[PDB]
Write an enzyme that holds these catalytic residues in place. Structure first.
Site, mmCIF file in Angstrom:
data_model
loop_
_atom_site.group_PDB
_atom_site.id
_atom_site.type_symbol
_atom_site.label_atom_id
_atom_site.label_comp_id
_atom_site.label_asym_id
_atom_site.label_seq_id
_atom_site.Cartn_x
_atom_site.Cartn_y
_atom_site.Cartn_z
ATOM 1 N N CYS A 1 0.966 -1.376 -0.193
ATOM 2 C CA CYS A 1 0.014 -0.041 -0.101
ATOM 3 C C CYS A 1 0.880 1.165 -0.008
ATOM 4 C CB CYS A 1 -0.944 0.078 1.003
ATOM 5 S SG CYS A 1 -2.098 -1.283 1.096
ATOM 6 N N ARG B 1 -7.700 -5.008 -3.418
ATOM 7 C CA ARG B 1 -7.454 -3.895 -4.264
ATOM 8 C C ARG B 1 -8.399 -3.414 -5.277
ATOM 9 N NH1 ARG B 1 -2.434 -2.688 -2.386
ATOM 10 N NH2 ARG B 1 -1.809 -4.739 -1.383
#
EC number: 1.11.1.24
Lengths: 210, 211, 211, 210, 210, 211
Positions: free
Chosen positions: B46, B116
């Site tokens: 991330c 995601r």
């Protein structure tokens, strides 16, 4: 409509290579597959895509990943359109394309809400990633290739892959160690970093050579 | 579970920039947005994504597309994680990030099957494209940039974009004319081509300079 | 599942000539139509049928009957297949062909039990005759031509047509008077015959020159 | 209402030749049948049709196809009407006609929405083709004969028949090879054409001698 | 929503020390636990509380009472916030904190009507006392320590504890004999008081040395 | 079963001071109340509690907080027990005590799962905090005093109170600024701190003198 993490449904399909059973036909050979849909035969964006795909098919195949197309047109039009590509763009398509006669399988897979859908399915029949692009914007199969590369590595090696791996801005083609999730694993990272086994920006952001 | 073509739901979200109403906040200024989820603050894939995104945010903004993140963590970890980014990678994140308290919004949008996921939402609140990647594999924001460049153009010029546009193997950065769907339209393609207005490999495969 | 006498359903179809409303498009100009299905583009029995039909289309049109095809394939294969016909058999198909996307219309009409079904639909939107042949056996458009010739005449002249008309074994191209159904009508046949107005094998079997 | 591809229903019928069980009575002798309906005894279009049919009955029979009529009139009127045909048109009807007393079997077969319906039923009891003509327009039994000829050949020989076979515009009485439906079968056609075993306008449009 | 006297529910939780099963993980070692919730990581009232708790953890542990926190934040933020406390307040947190990913366990325990809830649970898995403070007012862990001390004694010794024990206004750290509840037990108190075994303000208010 | 934030129910109760309506009786004079249950009259832990409470009642009252007890026993034992307190400990109880006839009110409030429950109810009839101790362990009214001191202050000054306030280990009797929840609020904390208006350990942990 299928979902990421889900099993690919058991289905018989008719293709330019004959009737096959999915996912079985691929999974029994220990192979992955990338099932992609496209709106119609003899359409210009789809034709650029088949060209792009054929140029990459052997790279996909060398990884154990077999591409398979799907469209709502009968197999005769499929075969004539593959011939127009050979005679006009000098490329011989040799991946199967499904003739999904009445949009049956497309309906079931939510490929018609037929758009530009991509499904990456592993050797156990599990959907690992899913893309839905609209009819007007062609895909980029380099990104799909990058994804399957990463998928394969993270399975084999127990690792995660950084933004844009293998060309990440900060760490290039190095892989990421899954973040420490307990006080004991944090200690383990700190020790591993002290032995040069891994490199870290912090105890939770560690990485190493492939 | 949302799908392409469907309208983004009306929802109030708490962000690092305050409380906002989606899609209205963006749609009222004529803007698109790219809503993307990420699993957790203080995680390494991330972080590389956030760095990637901030590098490109001004390119998205020049097109009238606002990026907006989302995670199941509270806004104080959001802001501390951003600070960590500034202090260690010296990059200042300046796009909003939603604190999705109990995964309420993540649930409605099907990003918890968060993995995601990416939603490209136009200026009418309509979801134009959706990506679902798994947790272990970071995205490539260059592809999302390319995708919205192409979406903006097809909307504005009534054209289609080839594989890998603006670097297509066969026609580079030219755009594609929607294929003739009738005998009369086919005659029209052949006339245009004879007048040098379009190039064609066939009556159904015509393209032209973006200009 | 449609049947003879039933009214053709109101449906919008996409064709090689554009989007049209059936039966209205044909019925509003006072025209009949022959709707016939065929299994797939780029198949050999269908190709011979298309060639057959184009040879006769102007004979159908002189009667005010418009042929219209239908297949489960999209309009771009339709038009490419027609082109193949022009380039290899040098015949230009100029009747519309429906692209029946998911077999929606094929389903409503019972042509997927498509096989080779034919629907003859008059200027009031009424199905006047139906043929269902199987996939392996091509039709004979000369029979369909003969059938609509006969239908037009029975409507306009209030008469019936003999086996194989206009080449009947017993009376050639003469037409048949609907049989007497009452004692009084029977008297009327016998009077007409005595006056040379009709020929009869019996009171219930009278016929006459089409004129 | 029956449908193409469907089994002919099990039914006992009363005929000018006695009570029979359909489809069994034909199918047990390995024979096909053509069941046709007609509105009424002593009607002019129907009488031209019985005449036409009797002229062709032996050609149908030589193929193993037995014609059988059906109308809603009792068998006594059926027999008197057959006699009027013998005494006035010099032809001896010798196929059975069903006396479908109350339109029962006609109702069930959708012969009344009684119109001019034709059902071709094979030796396994399967409806192979179906025609519905209105009461005002007589049939043409030459076309029905052509159809059964073709039906029979396509079953026996594994082939398809062109528009208007055996007098097709482009290939006369030659038969059509079922279109190649896979990349492997396309190759097979191309090889067979190179050996003069078949002739083609394209890899999907091949034909040969009967 | 749980209630005093009730069994702590069977649940697996994820913590900064790993996945554990409550109440089992504590109860199997014969230990009590104090489960407390707090609104969020990197908040000022909560941080004063973690500091307060860490200063007392060893006193709790010496009694056989293990403290465990809970908040709706992932374990990575939990661990970074514990590190900020070490680097800024010079205290090393070493009790587990649950990362109650979507408020699941908090919902079930009525910690969200997440407020400032405290649950004291004994070595048999029984909730013995429950506090609900609002988000704006920090707790005082000295009072919770006093409570568990008292809880433990009243279980072990069969006694009750006076207001503010072990510093009661009237009797300091002396314990209270459960009030006589029958005429026979009243007599027993009066005899015990006559032998100096207990002291009383009345037959129903008796007390003795710890 | 009541919970924090929920409004106290409208109920008439009989007390040693007469019949009153809760919460109205207290809320109409702008007062808070601390409703606490106790198991029975003529019991020793309760007696020590009553003594404790009467010692502090005037401290509660100076804040505008009225204590009110509750037991399942009738008002005549209530008053005789209070007298026993006066005669033997020479302390005069002068807060009301509810005689909860059949445990009706105890049931509605979930104090019979009475154990030793405490409800802090503000001047709007809203339950601000709840304690449930068991029968064997007497409460500490100093903690309840501390709790309402803190509640009054957070309401009036819009601030938060640290662990063990007004004797916090880290900041003593200073109060805490609600943490910044947005980038803009974080900038504001840093500006205030630079101007000496607040002290901070970080942008999210700022505090100040109560004044």
């Amino acid at each position: 409509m299928v979902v990421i993490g889900e099993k690919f449904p058991e289905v018989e399909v008719k293709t330019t290579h004959g009737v096959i059973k999915l996912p079985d036909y691929f999974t029994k050979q220990g192979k992955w597959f990338i099932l992609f849909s496209h709106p119609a035969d003899f359409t210009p964006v789809c034709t650029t895509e088949f060209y792009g795909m054929q140029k990459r098919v052997e790279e996909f195949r060398k990884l154990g990943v077999e591409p398979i197309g799907l469209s709502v047109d009968q197999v005769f039009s499929h075969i004539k359109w593959i011939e127009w590509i050979k005679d006009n763009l000098s490329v011989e398509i040799d991946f199967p394309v499904i003739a999904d006669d009445r949009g049956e399988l497309a309906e079931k897979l939510g490929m018609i809400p037929t758009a530009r859908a991509v499904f990456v399915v592993d050797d156990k029949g599990i959907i690992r990633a899913i893309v839905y692009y609209p009819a007007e914007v062609g895909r980029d199969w380099d990104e799909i290739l990058r994804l399957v590369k990463a998928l394969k590595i993270s399975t084999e090696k127990g690792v995660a892959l950084p933004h844009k791996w293998p060309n990440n801005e900060l760490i290039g083609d190095k892989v990421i160690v899954p973040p420490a999730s307990t006080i004991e694993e944090k200690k383990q990272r700190e020790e591993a970093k002290a032995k040069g086994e891994i490199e870290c920006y912090d105890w939770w952001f560690c990485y190493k050579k492939l």
